[PDB]
Amino acid sequence: KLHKEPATLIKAIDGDTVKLMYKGQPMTFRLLLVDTPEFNEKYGPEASAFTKKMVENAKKIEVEFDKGQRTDKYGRGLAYEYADGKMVNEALVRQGLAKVAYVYKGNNTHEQLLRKAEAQAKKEKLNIWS
Numbered sequence: 001k002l003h004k005e006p007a008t009l010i011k012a013i014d015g016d017t018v019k020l021m022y023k024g025q026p027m028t029f030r031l032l033l034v035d036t037p038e039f040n041e042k043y044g045p046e047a048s049a050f051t052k053k054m055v056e057n058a059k060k061i062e063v064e065f066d067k068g069q070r071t072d073k074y075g076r077g078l079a080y081e082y083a084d085g086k087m088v089n090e091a092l093v094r095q096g097l098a099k100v101a102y103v104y105k106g107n108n109t110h111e112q113l114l115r116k117a118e119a120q121a122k123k124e125k126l127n128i129w130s
């Protein structure tokens with residue numbers, strides 16, 4: 001059973017990275033289980049635009065750590081992000097703006113859910129699957 005924690009938006013960076021204030025400290029978060037294209041690659045600006053709009057227009061932003069590692073080798077926080085109850089990780093995957101990726105042992109609680117969303121976008125030929 002994972003628990004959602006409060007956080008405040010500092011700055012949207014790109015499709016799967018955002019700078020948030022967590023427990024009073026500035027911290028860069030990398031979204032769990034996803035991989036959006038870099039700004040330079042195809043659909044990159046769209047992914048960044050999608051995330052940016054989604055978090056900037058949210059009234060409440062929550063983070064949810066998984067069971068395994070909470071920080072990556074680059075010092076980034078690893079979590080599931082929620083914009084007014086809606087999981088940003090899943091939304092990106094549902095729109096075909098992100099691919100399910102970097103599935104490590106112990107940090108894959110929401111894996112099936114995201115795989116489900118991917119299969120839908122894949123069948124609908126959304127963005128990346130066009």
Ligand SMILES: Cc1cn([C@H]2C[C@H](OP(=O)(O)O)[C@@H](COP(=O)(O)O)O2)c(=O)[nH]c1=O
Nearest residue numbers: 017030031032033034035072073078102104
């Ligand atoms: C999503 C995720 C990424 N990472 C690391 C793997 C990648 O390192 P390597 O570059 O050394 O492969 C990097 C991918 O992040 P980005 O896609 O932001 O570049 O972040 C983790 O260690 N754990 C995770 O859960």
Ligand SMILES: [Ca+2]
Nearest residue numbers: 016035036037
């Ligand atoms: Ca990426």
